[PDB]
Amino acid sequence: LDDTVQLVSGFEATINKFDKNFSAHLLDLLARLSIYSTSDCEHGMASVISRLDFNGFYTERLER
Amino acid sequence: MPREIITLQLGQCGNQIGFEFWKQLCAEHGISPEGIVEEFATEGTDRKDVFFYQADDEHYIPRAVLLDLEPRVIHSILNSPYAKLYNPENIYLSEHGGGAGNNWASGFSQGEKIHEDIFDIIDREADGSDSLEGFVLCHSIAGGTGSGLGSYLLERLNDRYPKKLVQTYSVFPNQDEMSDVVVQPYNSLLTLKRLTQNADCVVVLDNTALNRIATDRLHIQNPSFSQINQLVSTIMSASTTTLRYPGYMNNDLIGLIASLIPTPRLHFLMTGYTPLTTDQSVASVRKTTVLDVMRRLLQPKNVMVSTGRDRQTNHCYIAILNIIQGEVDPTQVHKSLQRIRERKLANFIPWGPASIQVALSRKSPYLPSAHRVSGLMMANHTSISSLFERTCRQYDKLRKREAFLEQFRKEDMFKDNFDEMDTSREIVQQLIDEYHAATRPDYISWGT
Amino acid sequence: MPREIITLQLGQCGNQIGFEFWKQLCAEHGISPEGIVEEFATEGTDRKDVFFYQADDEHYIPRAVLLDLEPRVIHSILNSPYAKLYNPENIYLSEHGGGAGNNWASGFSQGEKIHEDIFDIIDREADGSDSLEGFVLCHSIAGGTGSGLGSYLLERLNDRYPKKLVQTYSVFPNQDEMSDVVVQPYNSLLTLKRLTQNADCVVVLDNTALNRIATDRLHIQNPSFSQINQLVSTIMSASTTTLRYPGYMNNDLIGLIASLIPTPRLHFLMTGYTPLTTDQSVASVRKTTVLDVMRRLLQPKNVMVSTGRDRQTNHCYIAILNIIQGEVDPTQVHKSLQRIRERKLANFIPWGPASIQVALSRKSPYLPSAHRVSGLMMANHTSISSLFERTCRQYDKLRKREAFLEQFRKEDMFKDNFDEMDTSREIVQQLIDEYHAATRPDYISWGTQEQE
Amino acid sequence: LDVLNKKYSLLDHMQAMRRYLLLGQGDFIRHLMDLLKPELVRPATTLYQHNLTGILETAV
């Protein structure tokens, strides 16, 4: 459809904030998954995790 | 309904690639050269409607458009057994038949001259498509027709079909060989300009890489255009296997390409094939494991791109998609992914999560496969910039020497200036740097 | 993962030894002359990755680099049935093919000229190594290529790979025969100088001892380079058996040698082999006992190192490691060590606790062993300094006569002076002094600059 | 005895105990210890059981 630039920048900031919240929730999910994988010895979730942070982007969040 | 794909084969190299692709697809799907399904083609498991159209309830005709500005190549395609595969109403041929003379600007002018015919053909093919996603152009970037006419067609598709996807099969000029086509840098510049502004995806086919692979991997001392076209047809067959072998995943082009293009600018795709074997080595079906398959695919001798050895830039993969076709054990895939991460066989972007996606696929049932397991790699790798950097260096070398620019000034697109070539060279340099930047954590701010 | 070892074969003698070593390793691992594992080699219990690389899922390629400044030896390796066994990217041949002219200085200059190419070849061979530990150099010290080019290659490896160990198998000139190469002692001195400065371990192979063994034991009046190379291949096979027959202990070279080499200067190694048998006596697998093994090993005729008779230094054994291959009872080993101690069959270092170590090893399952029991002796003996003193004396004999020194002066390493020969003499003197100290309780201060 | 051998591999279980629990696979034990060194040098409070199991499987 497109102050319009300001609206676009605000939309981008809101999208980035939603992305940040999603990433935080995903890191919390990964921690809970790690707990479950350690309880149930599920190697599948460990392989999924190793796939997810091959570049280590999620590695720092998991450490945190 | 399937998302039908129209294949446009442009210029000598592009038309050869398209013709060989259609031949290979017909062989894999059991489609006769006339577009009729062969009696042996009983495996109705292929999605022809993505790449082929049905002429009747039994005959599948390839959704392939053979486009040339010179009538010789179009006539040579029409002299093949597959002449009946393509819809003639989707075929636009430049009336002048003179080609572009290996001039991108001439190719663009010819596209402008055949604009009406081309858009009539495009609309005719579009009505035959139930859920057309977009157009796929097969062309050379070094010639005139596949480069210039291809760029014109891409621009007009972007303007007219802004909601449709634009994938290209773009044959890039040999960057390791000194091109005899003094205007090849102009053709390449026009193609890179259009890829930056009007194309959504450019699949780079480096004739230098084709020759290098033929020599070192295929043991072909002098790769012929026909042999390069046959290699391209093998690559296209592997790329279309998911249409020819329908499955649970990656059943659509957007699903396939989403993993490779994280941002709209990072739309330059590299290809990989596995297992790579020399023609003499067909005899021994090696029981290659997923780890072994990936290891052979990870060998530069098996990589379908001849990137120069850049010593200054720590080139890395931005993204990897591995499409594996054939009999695949999930435990072998899991061990392969574990070993790949553990062995760091691929370096990923430092600014975001990146991985090698792995798809397991069935082979085409109509074509007997000598290999139990085959694999395609799709990768965004910063070393591909070295091919792009080399092309940029050749462009700059010609522009700084004004080589063959008088021939471009004869054509209206380049008559007044070559500013489009200089902007293309600058864009390609920025692209190379971004691909190198994409190996670094600061890629998050790259291009800002 | 195995600690891969790159084998460097230098000059005519060194290259023949390296080629035969790679052949022997292939035979022990059941690798065909083309590099393919033989169908009978079904025992996947061997560590090929220590000495071999996989060329394909079936083909094992030796991690061996054949390096010469003269193309003849590299071509002769490439002319063997095993030419297809080795990875061709691990084969470096000097483009000039001229060798060093039996001049160590010329070989060093050629290595420096081929430094980039040689290190590219080394890296190409290294990429075939999953966990390369370091390089093993097989060479002659009397020639030009194996001595000079070997020294240059060692220098460039030390510069590029300063954290990796460099062991050499350096074939020393025959000391009992008058060498027709009057500069052979000069070439040997320059090579020993470089080994002192840039190598961490030099295995001394005295061509005089090889010829003597061939004459007395093999009945070979004139031991050929080929016969010496075949003996070297047998020795390399025995040295790699512990890699090829994996067990609880001594699975790596550094773990085995750590106890044997206390200081960097005491890097002159002596070798021993047991039982020594003529080729014809392979038929009877003798049930040799641990006591019988130890008794035969103590015979100088069975020691694979020709140490000079030093009359000035009270040479002694600092430590002994016996690598025994075949059926070995641990209780028999214990009783043998007890009897050796009671009989004082081994002299230990006077400055610290020392004993004769005994290692039991399995034989290769793919290679039928004609002998029930085989053995390697590793020993630290101060008399090895006498070999270095003899080499220094030979250098001085050539240097004092300036015989054939003009050929070394033609090469830049020796063009201005013969300082490499004087440094070799000084290093051999320091080795003698430390070896004599190592027989004494004052060895605690041996190798200290105040004691030097 | 036939049942024990075929179903429980009692002699094979003893050989496995020798190879692994007695460190008979010395190359394997060496590589495992080498891999654990950066982990085993760390405080035990910093060890992740899932990570340690994955390291064990990887070393094997």
Task: Report on the architecture of this protein.
This is part of a larger assembly, with one copy of chain A (about 60 residues), two copies of chain B and one copy of chain D (about 60 residues). Chain A contains three helices and no strands. Chain A is mostly helical. Chain A starts with a helix and ends with a helix. Chain B is α/β, with parallel strands linked by helices. Chain B is built from 15 helices and eleven strands. In chain D, about 75% of the residues lie in helices and about 0% in strands. Chains in contact: A-B, A-D, B-C, C-D.
C-alpha end-to-end distance of chain A: 41 Å
The span between the termini of chain B is: 41 Å
Structure classification of chain B = alpha/beta
Element-by-element helix/strand order of chain B: EHHEEEHHHEHEHEHHHEHEHEEHHH
* Largest sheet geometry of chain A: none
* Strand residues, percent of chain A: under 5%
PDB class: structural protein
Keywords: Tubulin complex, structural protein
Entry title: Cryo-EM reconstruction of the NEDD1 anchor protein and CDK5RAP2 bound to the gamma-tubulin ring complex
Chain A: Isoform 3 of Gamma-tubulin complex component 2
Which secondary structure elements does this structure contain, and how are they paired or packed?
This is part of a larger assembly, with 1 copy of chain A (64 residues), 2 copies of chain B and 1 copy of chain D (60 residues).
Chain A: H1 4-40, H2 43-52, H3 57-63
Helix pairs in contact in A: 1-2
Chain B: E1 5-10, H1 11-29, H2 48-51, E2 52-54, E3 60-62, E4 64-67, H3 71-78, H4 104-113, H5 115-127, E5 134-140, H6 145-160, E6 165-172, H7 184-197, E7 201-206, H8 207-216, H9 225-244, H10 253-258, E8 268-274, H11 290-297, E9 317-326, H12 330-343, E10 356-361, E11 373-381, H13 383-401, H14 405-409, H15 419-437
Parallel strand pairs in B: 1-4, 1-5, 5-6, 6-7, 7-8, 9-10
Antiparallel strand pairs in B: 2-3, 8-11, 9-11
Helix pairs in contact in B: 1-6, 1-9, 4-6, 6-7, 7-13, 7-15, 11-12, 13-15
Chain D: H1 2-8, H2 10-21, H3 26-40, H4 49-59
Helix pairs in contact in D: 1-2, 3-4
Descriptive tags:
part of a larger assembly; 4 chains; A: 64 residues; mainly alpha; 84% helix; elongated; B: 448 residues; alpha/beta; 9-stranded mixed sheet; structural constituent of cytoskeleton (chain B); nucleotide-binding (chain B); Tub_FtsZ_C (chain B)
